[PDB]
């Protein structure tokens, strides 16, 4: 039917900063649990709450605090922010204490030293080599999302509108091309004949994860908040 | 308690169409076991839950893993043909029977590589204070970095007079990738400018790399990336 949620889903803060994490536990569910997990790293457990009382604490940092409400849903309250809390923060709900837990899909915080560092990608779309073509009769479009910092990007291909998977090929990890700018590339593969029907529509469509309405930013450039990049083609006859 | 589940093994690097086994040992007593997949940066994937070895539950569980509970509870993830979208953090979980509370596992990092010949471990760098900063600050901070490594198996940690230390260190949360085969990591350890002035105070950057298996196969030419224990250390000093 539906699972626990939770907002935001990607947050970016300056050292120093605070925020607020947020968790809707299924509905029917009185037991609300908080992780905090390093990237790549095991599970951490934080805290359990259940029936708005405290049940359980693990290693939850003095600067946290959390507290669940009337209708079950808990809060992080997370302050005076460091580089080292930068993690996935998941919380999961059971219908009681000592019961089966279901997960939130987590929260991605990163905390940066200078928000100025802050800069969408721009990406660009590489139509097929003409020597890729008469060689092999595949065709294939590179993808480059670059000048990013920092790296929360979602990359996505669309062909005549819809997403498509098959022939895709993504960098698994982006990587710094300088101390603030990310790069990732990806190629879509295609049949020679697909790629050269003129009608065809290609879009490599990006998501960047930035700053939100709610972070100053200073007068000068635009704002660096969440938003999407993309570059298309068409497909070309011989 | 008295312990929690355990998992094997801890890490471990893989060639594209290859298969491996992940397994888990639940808590004394446990007898229901589920396993979930984690990219990394994302979300637990639930894949299957066996009950007094009873398949249950099953959620998108590729065709390629097959999954058993055996007669001690304990379970073994059997992989094949692995992908490289394959990589990522296995964990297992245990509750006494289905519905209850589950504990986790350590988890298993399992990475899968087109080519074993990329691996490498890192090189470790220990850099003394800057005699601006001891003589401005009255802090001594010794920086680590370890790099050149691939993949992202690495883990630092900071002795003092033999003993690990927790206070005054700073470690970079996550390593970043420099290029498509080699990642970055850098610690601090700061501590007072008189504790640094001692030349019998031993300070050592301690970084564990874990690679290649005794038993996979290398090429003849330079040393195989297995894993293995590399620091770098300095002792305090004297007025300069």
Not at 43 to 54: A, N, P, S
Not at 161 to 169: A, I, L, M, N, R
Not at 215 to 225: A, Q
Request: aromatic content about 12%; hydrophobic content about 30%.
């Amino acid at each position: 039917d539906s699972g626990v949620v939770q907002s935001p889903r990607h947050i970016i803060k300056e050292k120093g900063g605070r925020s607020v994490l947020t968790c809707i536990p299924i509905s029917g569910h009185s037991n609300v649990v908080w992780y905090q997990q390093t990237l790549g790293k095991e599970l951490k457990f934080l805290i359990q709450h259940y029936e708005k009382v405290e049940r359980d604490k693990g290693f939850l940092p003095s600067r946290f605090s959390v507290q669940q409400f009337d209708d079950y849903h808990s809060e992080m309250n997370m302050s005076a922010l460091e580089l080292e809390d930068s993690a996935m923060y998941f919380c999961a709900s059971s219908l009681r204490w000592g019961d089966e837990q279901y997960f939130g899909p987590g929260t991605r915080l990163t905390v940066l030293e200078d928000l100025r560092n802050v800069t969408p990608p721009k990406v660009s779309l590489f139509e097929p080599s003409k020597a890729e073509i008469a060689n092999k009769q595949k065709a294939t479009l590179v993808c480059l999302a670059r000048g990013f910092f920092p790296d929360h990007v979602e990359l996505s291909w669309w062909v005549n509108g819809k997403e498509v998977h098959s022939g895709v090929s993504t960098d698994p990890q982006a990587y710094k091309e300088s101390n603030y700018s990310y790069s990732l590339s990806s190629r879509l593969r295609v049949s020679a004949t697909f790629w050269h029907n003129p009608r065809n529509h290609f879009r490599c469509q990006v998501q960047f994860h930035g700053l939100s309405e709610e972070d100053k930013w200073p007068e000068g450039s635009p704002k660096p908040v969440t938003q999407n990049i993309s570059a298309e083609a068409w497909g070309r006859a011989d």
